[PDB]
């Protein structure tokens, strides 16, 4: 069993006003079972999509989960991951230097 | 467009 | 530049919540263009890219009543594992496939591949001369047997010799505009201060396609591996990818490090250092 990478990051270098993506880039897990949610401000983002499951040369796993949105100074963005691996659910926020 | 290799088996 | 085309076969049990799921992907390259699922509604190979939207019904007919056969014949795969290793029927497991073709700048097929796995774990693999078989354990060397006696490397040679290319120099000439076009890093140095003695130098690459790209930091001309934190190569979401490099560097001691990229989108390699 391998636990997930996660990278949160968005489409383009963020200004804050202007509109952009929001990708939480979750890789190298396996098995394939796995839950990611985007967060703004600690609550569940419902208009999110994700990449179709696919995996790389060591077999592991890998996804896109995305959603649109406009970064603030103050807005606090996250992405949540769980997978067997985990004990408890994994956040990582979203850093725009990252 | 995909391998048509049905008939293969583990 | 060279070119690949690869299918992505997983299959995944789960027991007591439905039979084992079966997807399929297929790309060009870096470039995903078609999916098949069998959990969705109405099962079928459906596009994924713009270039293979044109193929006619007749196309996605065969791919869709081939995948739905695999969809049975992977859940029977499933089932052999668990013979070929005295597993029990109550944990998932999952097969994984990969296959397809590599081009070389001429054109022409530079190598195939066909290999399996087992719970994330090399099980076979079709050898570069694609007329004999890699078996990883004793389990896999009964699946030999059984490719062996059917043909199966014959029939998969004559595939990635010959469908397998004709169809990718189909795709790349239908997506010339995308497949064919590299796209270069937009390539910058930022800077985070750490403390008073240290900051962190980190080079960044945006935009780019294929995904494929070398970052490297050097401190006075010596390359900085073993100290530089490079984040994997990720989706923008826009078909491009990211990266970045990171060192930390004595303050005052910037202009020493220089970021090195190589793309194929590059006339040259570019060399990069902090502007202030
Ligand atoms: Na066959
Ligand atoms: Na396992």
């Given at each position: 069993q391998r636990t997930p990478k996660i990278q949160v990051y968005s489409r383009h270098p963020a200004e804050n006003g202007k509109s952009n993506f929001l990708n939480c880039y979750v890789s190298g897990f396996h098995p394939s079972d796995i839950?990611?949610?985007?967060?703004?401000?600690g609550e569940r983002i419902e208009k999110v999509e994700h990449s179709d499951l696919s995996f790389s040369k060591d077999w592991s796993f890998?996804?896109?989960?995305?959603?649109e949105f406009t970064p603030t100074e103050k807005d606090e963005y996250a992405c949540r991951v769980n997978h067997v691996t985990l004990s408890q659910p994994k956040i990582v926020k979203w850093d725009r230097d990252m | 467009s995909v391998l048509?290799?049905?008939?293969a088996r583990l | 530049g060279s070119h690949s085309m690869r299918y992505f076969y997983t299959a995944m049990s789960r027991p007591g919540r439905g039979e084992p799921r079966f997807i399929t992907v297929g790309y060009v390259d870096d470039t995903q263009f078609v999916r098949f699922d069998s959990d969705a509604t109405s099962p079928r190979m459906a596009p994924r890219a713009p270039w293979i939207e044109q193929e006619g019904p007749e196309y996605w007919d065969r791919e869709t009543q081939i995948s739905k056969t695999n969809t049975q014949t992977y859940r029977e795969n499933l089932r052999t594992a668990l013979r070929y290793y005295n597993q029990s029927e109550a944990g998932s497991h999952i097969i994984q496939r990969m296959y397809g073709c590599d081009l070389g700048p001429d054109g022409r097929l530079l190598r195939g591949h066909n290999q399996l796995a087992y719970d994330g774990k090399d099980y076979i693999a079709l050898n570069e001369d694609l007329s004999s078989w890699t078996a990883a354990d004793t389990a896999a060397q009964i699946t030999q047997?059984?490719?062996?006696?059917?043909?199966?490397?014959?029939?998969?040679?004559?595939?990635?010799?010959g469908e397998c290319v004709e169809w990718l120099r189909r795709y790349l000439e239908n997506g010339k505009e995308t497949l064919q076009r590299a796209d270069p890093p937009k390539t910058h140095?930022?800077?985070?201060?750490?403390?008073d003695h240290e900051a962190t130098l980190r080079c960044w690459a945006l935009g780019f396609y294929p995904a494929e790209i070398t970052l490297t930091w050097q401190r006075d001309g010596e390359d900085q591996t073993q100290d530089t934190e490079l984040v994997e190569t990720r989706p923008a979401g826009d078909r491009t990818f990211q990266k970045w490099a990171a060192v930390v560097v004595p303050s005052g001691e910037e202009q020493r490090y220089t970021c090195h990229v190589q793309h194929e989108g590059l006339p040259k390699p570019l060399t990069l250092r902090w502007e202030p």
């Open positions: 839950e990611v949610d985007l967060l703004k401000n890998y996804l896109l989960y995305y959603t | 048509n290799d049905i008939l | 047997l059984k490719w062996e006696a059917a043909r199966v490397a014959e029939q998969l040679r004559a595939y990635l010799e140095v930022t800077h985070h201060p750490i403390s």
